Structure 1
Amino acid sequence: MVDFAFELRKAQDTGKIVMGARKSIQYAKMGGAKLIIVARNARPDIKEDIEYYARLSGIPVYEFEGTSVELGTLLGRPHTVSALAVVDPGASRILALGG
């Protein structure tokens, strides 16, 4: 099974990700990510904008089952992260979550 926590870290360390709602929306807009991940408690309008821009470009969106606190912690940050975009999956299987 594709293990979200492990593969996300592996993408972070061997590929390229960008963190936060601001950059995640930008990258969805420009068609410059391969997956957008949102925390379950991402702000409704931010979820909706991400889902919309990703749909325009054919970019899958995956909702992480935990909070932005948990997502931040997984990503090695002492702050919330409510969304991120995987630009390059590196050696990871993270894009399998896009279905």
Structure 2
Amino acid sequence: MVDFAFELRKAQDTGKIVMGARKSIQYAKMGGAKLIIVARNARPDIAEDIEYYARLSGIPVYAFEGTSVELGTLLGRPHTVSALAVVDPGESRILALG
């Protein structure tokens, strides 16, 4: 079983993650993310856009069971994060969530 918070942080530290709806959609759109993570309270249209662009490319989407406040904190930020994209997992097992 995958340790979300550990592996998310491990991927943030040893790989490449981009944060926020805009960059998530962008990396989804262009085929450059290997995984998209979305907080439970992402704006419904932003969540549906991600889902859409993700399904176009066959990129898995993971629904973080938690708010954008919790997700932002997990990524070490003092502000909300409604979505993020794992471009490079580094040494982490985060892509196993897919």
Runs of 5+ consecutive residues of structure 1 not aligned to the other structure: none
Q: Offset of 1:94 from its aligned partner?
A: 0.2
Q: Offset of 1:44 from its aligned partner?
A: 0.2
Structure 1 equivalent of residue 34 of structure 2: 34
Q: Offset of 1:55 from its aligned partner?
A: 0.3
Matched position secondary structure for 1:48? helix
Q: Offset of 1:11 from its aligned partner?
A: 0.2
Q: Offset of 1:28 from its aligned partner?
A: 0.2
Matched position secondary structure for 2:49? helix
| Superposed CA RMSD | 0.5
TM-score, L = length of structure 1:
0.98
TM-score, L = length of structure 2:
0.99
Matched position secondary structure for 1:24? helix
Matched position secondary structure for 2:41? coil
Count matched residues. Answer: 98
Deviations 1:17-45 (Å, cap 9, x if unpaired)? 00000000000000100000000000000
Q: Percent identity?
A: 97
